[PDB]
Every structure is written in structure tokens, then in C-alpha cells.
Amino acid sequence: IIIATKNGKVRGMQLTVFGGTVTAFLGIPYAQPPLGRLRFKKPQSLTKWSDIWNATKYANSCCQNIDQSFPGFHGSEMWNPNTDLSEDCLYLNVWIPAPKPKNATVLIWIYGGGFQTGTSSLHVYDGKFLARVERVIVVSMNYRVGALGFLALPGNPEAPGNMGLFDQQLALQWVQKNIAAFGGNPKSVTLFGESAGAASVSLHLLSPGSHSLFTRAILQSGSFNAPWAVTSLYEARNRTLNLAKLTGCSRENETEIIKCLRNKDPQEILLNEAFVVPYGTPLSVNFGPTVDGDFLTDMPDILLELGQFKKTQILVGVNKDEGTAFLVYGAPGFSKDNNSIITRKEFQEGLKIFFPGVSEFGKESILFHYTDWVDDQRPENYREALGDVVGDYNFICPALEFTKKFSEWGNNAFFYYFEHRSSKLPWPEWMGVMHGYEIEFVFGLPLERRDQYTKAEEILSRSIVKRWANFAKYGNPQETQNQSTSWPVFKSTEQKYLTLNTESTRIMTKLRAQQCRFWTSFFPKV
Ligand SMILES: *[C@@H]1O[C@H](CO[C@@H]2O[C@@H](C)[C@@H](O)[C@@H](O)[C@@H]2O)[C@@H](O[C@@H]2O[C@H](CO)[C@@H](O)[C@H](O)[C@H]2NC(C)=O)[C@H](O)[C@H]1NC(C)=O
Ligand SMILES: *[C@@H]1O[C@H](CO[C@@H]2O[C@@H](C)[C@@H](O)[C@@H](O)[C@@H]2O)[C@@H](O[C@@H]2O[C@H](CO)[C@@H](O)[C@H](O)[C@H]2NC(C)=O)[C@H](O)[C@H]1NC(C)=O
Ligand SMILES: CCCC[N@H+](C)[C@@H](Cc1c[nH]c2ccccc12)C[N@H+](C)CCC1CCCCCC1
Ligand SMILES: *[C@@H]1O[C@H](CO[C@@H]2O[C@@H](C)[C@@H](O)[C@@H](O)[C@@H]2O)[C@@H](O)[C@H](O)[C@H]1NC(C)=O
Ligand SMILES: *[C@@H]1O[C@H](CO)[C@@H](O)[C@H](O)[C@H]1NC(C)=O
Ligand SMILES: *[C@@H]1O[C@H](CO)[C@@H](O)[C@H](O)[C@H]1NC(C)=O
Numbered sequence: 019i020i021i022a023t024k025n026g027k028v029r030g031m032q033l034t035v036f037g038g039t040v041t042a043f044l045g046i047p048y049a050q051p052p053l054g055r056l057r058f059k060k061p062q063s064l065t066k067w068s069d070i071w072n073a074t075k076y077a078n079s080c081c082q083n084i085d086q087s088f089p090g091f092h093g094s095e096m097w098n099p100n101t102d103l104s105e106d107c108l109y110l111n112v113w114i115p116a117p118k119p120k121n122a123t124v125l126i127w128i129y130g131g132g133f134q135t136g137t138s139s140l141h142v143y144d145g146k147f148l149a150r151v152e153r154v155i156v157v158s159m160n161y162r163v164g165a166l167g168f169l170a171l172p173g174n175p176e177a178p179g180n181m182g183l184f185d186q187q188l189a190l191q192w193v194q195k196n197i198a199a200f201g202g203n204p205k206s207v208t209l210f211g212e213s214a215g216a217a218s219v220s221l222h223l224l225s226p227g228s229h230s231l232f233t234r235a236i237l238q239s240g241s242f243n244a245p246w247a248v249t250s251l252y253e254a255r256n257r258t259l260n261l262a263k264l265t266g267c268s269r270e271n272e273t274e275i276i277k278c279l280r281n282k283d284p285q286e287i288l289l290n291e292a293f294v295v296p297y298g299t300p301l302s303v304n305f306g307p308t309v310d311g312d313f314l315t316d317m318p319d320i321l322l323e324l325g326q327f328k329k330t331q332i333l334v335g336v337n338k339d340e341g342t343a344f345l346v347y348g349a350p351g352f353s354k355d356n357n358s359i360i361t362r363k364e365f366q367e368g369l370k371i372f373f374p375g376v377s378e379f380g381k382e383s384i385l386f387h388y389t390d391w392v393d394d395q396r397p398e399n400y401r402e403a404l405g406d407v408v409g410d411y412n413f414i415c416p417a418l419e420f421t422k423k424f425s426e427w428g429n430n431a432f433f434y435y436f437e438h439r440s441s442k443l444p445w446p447e448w449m450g451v452m453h454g455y456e457i458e459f460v461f462g463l464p465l466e467r468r469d470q471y472t473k474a475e476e477i478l479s480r481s482i483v484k485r486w487a488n489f490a491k492y493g494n495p496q497e498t499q500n501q502s503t504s505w506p507v508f509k510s511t512e513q514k515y516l517t518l519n520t521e522s523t524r525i526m527t528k529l530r531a532q533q534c535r536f537w538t539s540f541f542p543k544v
């Protein structure tokens with residue numbers, strides 16, 4: 019129950035899972051807490067300790083704003099931090115199978131949340147099922163989000179940007195140096211993450227400092243080329259100083275703005291994060307990844323285009339209704355408590371909310387490409403069109419474009435299309451297969467029969483868990499034993515992808531082809 023790490027001993031705890039045992043090490047620190055003079059700076063090496071660190075409970079989440087739009091609603095509150103917020107939050111978790119494995123493949127989870135929210139202690143990121151069922155080791159880490167993790171004064175070590183990504187990177191290196199003692203194989207490490215976590219995984223594929231820290235990569239509903247994933251150096255500067263004046267720390271010695279921002283309390287920085295953008299959207303990433311010249315040496319679309327990334331296998335995918343969740347966060351006529359039938363005029367109003375800095379012509383171009391119906395009667399159109407608009411633009415086609423360009427350099431790629439709405443989904447049915455609701459199936463929560471899932475959901479998750487594990491172990495996301503559909507490699511010519519659902523697992527081609535050609539070629543010009 020005790021493991022000796024390179025900086026000290028850690029005590030874990032035993033968990034009963036599916037008539038077996040999983041050993042959990044919740045809340046191991048991997049960096050010196052970024053407090054006081056270290057706020058906004060890269061994570062620092064952790065001083066060795068002499069006692070037994072008790073890693074028997076999730077540690078603090080990093081400071082962050084909370085989704086308060088539906089108090090008491092499990093559909094939104096399940097994503098809010100389930101542990102204390104604090105700047106002392108650079109910790110990680112380890113689930114190892116019992117008995118202790120000998121050279122187990124390691125899965126490292128990076129949570130999403132728009133680079134402003136999220137925590138690894140969430141119930142749907144519980145790594146005990148993966149450890150139990152597939153005998154892999156699951157690692158997850160907390161990393162700073164929001165301005166505390168991504169405030170950027172480019173070149174300035176007081177606030178260089180991408181600190182949260184560097185938290186992630188330091189956690190990966192912790193796995194490199196320590197996971198063998200847990201029975202993990204440091205040479206068989208697969209990163210996986212969702213949304214901003216997935217975009218973070220994609221940026222680790224491009225960051226040279228991360229190329230030796232992992233083997234393979236899984237990208238769930240996200241990639242760096244998504245329009246929300248990377249902040250310009252222009253916007254970054256304009257935004258760190260908008261925060262400065264909003265907190266009354268505007269100076270000319272740029273270093274002196276940071277020391278002044280370092281004395282304001284976390285909540286004051288949190289409450290001003292929202293107003294630093296002129297017109298926000300429900301997908302606004304006020305403080306995100308930037309081209310810092312350290313973690314990210316160039317603009318990532320160029321690195322992707324010119325083949326500058328770790329050459330390895332990727333597993334990429336999206337859900338059928340990526341965009342619906344965001345429409346009840348500002349789009350008029352929408353609500354989780356009715357079926358949100360909206361007019362043409364409300365649809366047009368919705369575009370101005372999701373594309374506020376977009377010209378009149380650009381917004382008409384979106385309307386034109388998405389509102390030439392197969393059929394004019396049906397009242398659900400403008401409602402579903404707006405969801406497809408936000409979904410295709412923000413997630414699906416950035417992911418497809420990332421997979422096309424990555425695969426063009428000779429690596430095996432696998433694309434999935436998750437289209438099962440969970441039986442336990444608390445959101446209304448018109449939102450469909452929502453953003454983030456493939457995660458519970460990936461972590462194998464439907465495998466616990468005591469948690470209200472249908473047996474078809476247990477079987478789908480069990481296959482997904484096997485495919486994910488086989489990809490991590492072997493670079494190939496097949497289920498070989500139960501006469502399952504083979505998952506074909508995604509090539510840029512034919513673009514085959516695999517659909518994931520309870521009934522029919524089928525091979526299709528060229529997902530959302532007509533929609534993405536608009537989004538990836540025409541729309542970036544407007
Ligand atoms: C860059 O930032 C300026 C300043 O932002 C304003 O001040 C901040 C403290 C915060 O309160 C923001 O909400 C403010 O917008 C932006 O300039 C403002 O632009 C909007 C309209 O576009 C409007 O509030 C004011 O006319 C402007 N204020 C000033 C002082 O110029 C600017 O739009 C941002 N973006 C760019 C590209 O410059
Ligand atoms: C779906 O509901 C929204 C509003 O939700 C509820 O209704 C409000 C009266 C209020 O009690 C909220 O707290 C509820 O959650 C409807 O949008 C409203 O539509 C009318 C139009 O005149 C008006 O109340 C507001 O302008 C709208 N509010 C908005 C856009 O936020 C919407 O019409 C409903 N749709 C259907 C099909 O029932
Ligand atoms: C006030 C602080 C919390 C605000 N949220 C957590 C934001 C997070 C976020 C910002 N930018 C992003 C880009 C891409 C993906 C996510 C984000 C925006 N949404 C309000 C997410 C809320 C919904 C997300 C979808 C999953 C389930 C339904 C819930
Ligand atoms: C670390 O934990 C030691 C053992 O704690 C054991 O496990 C926990 C979950 C409780 O059930 C406790 O009663 C058990 O004995 C402690 O003896 C030790 O004091 C702890 N040290 C610190 C610094 O917390
Ligand atoms: C684990 O596997 C790697 C290769 O994947 C090998 O180099 C290493 O020696 C193995 N460690 C063991 C078996 O303890
Ligand atoms: C203010 O001056 C320069 C930047 O102009 C900087 O090097 C210096 O460190 C700043 N002052 C302090 C006390 O850091």
C-alpha cells in the first residue's frame with residue numbers, strides 16, 4: 019500500500035471494484051504550489067519530502083469560475099469542481115490494478131473545460147474501472163485554468179503564458195520518472211482528453227518538450243485548430259492589460275503589472291476574467307494557449323500544415339450533437355426545459371451571439387449554407403441548424419481537419435463518431451448526443467450495473483473501453499474477440515470513420531463533408 023517515489027513515499031488506499039481490487043493514489047503533488055511569487059510562473063520542481071505522503075483523497079481543484087446557470091441541475095453541476103478550490107492545486111492521481119502490474123500501459127487523462135474550468139476529481143473521470151477491467155494504469159492531473167494558468171506576457175517569465183500546459187507537461191514527466199515504481203511502463207504512455215483536454219493533447223503532439231513524455235494520443239471532441247483553442251498574441255496582450263485596468267494594476271513596467279496582480283486575491287482575478295473580452299460567447303476562452311515561444315514555438319496551424327509534430331498513432335472523434343449544450347447558454351428562444359423551437363429571426367439572433375465579431379456577410383453565409391432545407395415545414399429546423407452550426411464550426415470539422423492533415427504524414431489515424439444518447443442524460447432529448455457525454459462510456463461507468471444504465475450501454479462501453487485500451491497498448495483500436503466491426507485507418511483520400519452506438523457499429527466515409535468545406539475553406543476568409 020506504500021510506494022517509494024523519487025521525492026518521497028506515498029500511501030495509497032484500496033478500492034473494491036467488480037469483485038476485485040484497485041489501488042488508488044489520490045492527490046500526489048507534482049510541483050511546488052504556485053503561490054505568492056510563483057503565481058503566473060511555470061511550475062517549479064518539488065522539494066523532496068521525508069515522511070509518508072497520504073494520497074488517500076482528491077486534492078484541491080485549481081481556482082476557477084463555476085457554472086451557476088442551472089443551480090441544482092445535475093446536468094451542469096456534474097462538471098463543477100467536487101473539491102475545494104485553491105491555488106495549491108498541482109496534484110495528480112494514480113489508479114493501478116491489484117495485484118500490482120509488472121509493465122502496464124499507462125493512460126493519462128487531461129480534463130477539458132474551455133481552459134477556464136475543470137478538475138480531475140470529477141466522478142466521470144474515475145480511473146478505477148479502467149484499471150480494474152483492462153489492467154492499465156490511469157493517471158490524471160490538475161492544471162491551472164483561466165488567467166491563473168494562461169495569462170500571457172510573451173517572453174516575460176513572470177507571466178509567459180501556457181502555464182497550465184506546463185503543469186500538464188510536468189505531470190507527464192512525473193509519470194516518466196516515477197510510474198515504473200507503480201508497475202507502469204513509461205515507454206507505453208497514451209494521453210487522452212476531452213474538449214480543451216483534447217486540444218491540450220494535440221498541442222503536446224506539437225510541443226518538442228513533450229515528444230519524449232508519451233507514446234500515443236487520443237483526442238475526444240477537441241483539437242488545437244478549433245477556433246476557441248488558441249489565443250493570438252494580439253488578443254493575449256490586449257486581455258492581460260484589460261485585466262490589469264479592471265484590477266487597478268495598470269503600469270508601464272510590464273513586470274510590475276504582474277507583481278501587482280500577484281497581490282490581488284484569486285477571486286478578484288476570477289471575477290474580472292469574463293469582462294476582458296469586448297463581446298463574449300458561451301464558448302469564450304478568455305485565457306488559453308498562446309504561441310509563447312517555449313511550449314509552442316510557432317503558430318500551430320503552420321506546424322500542423324508542415325508536418326512538425328510527434329509521429330505516432332492518433333485516435334480522434336466527436337459526438338453527433340457537439341453544439342447543442344452551448345445554445346441554452348445565451349441563444350434566444352432556447353431552454354433546457356422546453357423543446358426550443360426557434361424562428362428564422364431567432365436563428366439569425368443566435369448567430370450574432372455565437373459570431374459577434376463576424377461581418378453581416380459572414381453571418382448570412384452561415385445562414386445560407388445551413389438553411390436550405392430538405393423541407394420547409396418542419397418546426398425543428400432553425401433549432402437543429404443552430405446546433406449543427408456551433409457543433410460543426412467549433413468541434414467536428416476542426417477535429418476532422420486535424421485528422422486529415424496529421425494522417426497525411428504517414429501515421430495511422432482512427433476517427434470515431436459517437437452517436438449514443440445516454441439513458442441517464444439529464445438534459446432534454448432535443449440536445450441529443452451532447453458534448454462531453456461520451457466520457458462516461460470511455461471511463462466504463464456503464465460497467466457498474468448498479469448505476470441505472472441499460473445493458474446495451476454496458477456492452478457499448480465495454481467495447482469502447484477495450485478499443486481504447488488496445489489503442490493504448492497496441493496502437494490499434496480493435497475489439498478482436500467478439501466478432502466486432504474492424505476499425506479502419508482514417509486516410510485523407512477515403513476518410514473512413516467508425517460510428518459508436520448500442521445497435522449498429524458501421525463504417526462510413528467523409529463525415530459532414532458539405533458542412534466542413536464551408537467551415538474550413540470558405541468561412542476562414544470572411
Ligand atoms: C482591446 O481592449 C480594448 C479595451 O477593452 C475595454 O476595457 C477593458 C478594461 C474591459 O472593460 C473591456 O470590456 C472593454 O471593452 C477594447 O476597446 C474597447 O472596445 C469596445 C468596443 O469594441 C468598447 O468597450 C470601447 O469602445 C473600447 N474601449 C477602449 C478603452 O478603447 C478593444 O475592443 C479590445 N480589442 C481590440 C482588438 O483592440
Ligand atoms: C422556451 O422557454 C424560453 C424561456 O424559458 C422560460 O420562460 C420564461 C418566461 C421564464 O420563466 C424563464 O425563466 C423560463 O425558463 C422562451 O423564451 C422566451 O420567450 C418569450 C417570448 O416572448 C419571452 O418570455 C422571452 O423573450 C424569451 N426568453 C428568452 C429568449 O430567454 C421560449 O419561447 C420557450 N420556447 C418554447 C417553444 O416554449
Ligand atoms: C462561468 C465559468 C464556467 C463556464 N463554462 C464551464 C464554459 C466552458 C467553456 C468555455 N469555452 C469553451 C470552449 C469549448 C468547450 C467548453 C468551454 C462555457 N459553457 C457554459 C460550458 C457548459 C456546458 C459544456 C458542455 C458539456 C455539458 C454542458 C455544460
Ligand atoms: C497518514 O495516514 C496514516 C494511516 O492512516 C490510516 O488510513 C486512514 C484512511 C485512516 O483510516 C487512519 O485511521 C488509518 O490509520 C496515519 O497514521 C498518519 O497519521 C497520517 N499522516 C498524516 C500526516 O496525515
Ligand atoms: C517494459 O517494456 C519495455 C518496452 O516496452 C522494456 O524496455 C522494459 O524493460 C520493460 N520493463 C519490465 C518488463 O519490467
Ligand atoms: C522595472 O524596470 C525593468 C523594465 O523596464 C525591469 O528589468 C525591472 O526589473 C523592473 N523593476 C523591478 C523592481 O523589477
Ligand SMILES: *[C@@H]1O[C@H](CO)[C@@H](O)[C@H](O)[C@H]1NC(C)=O
Nearest residue numbers: 477480481484497498499500
Ligand atoms: C465479449 O462477449 C462476452 C460474452 O460472450 C462478454 O462477457 C465480454 O465482456 C465481451 N468482450 C468485450 C471486449 O466486449
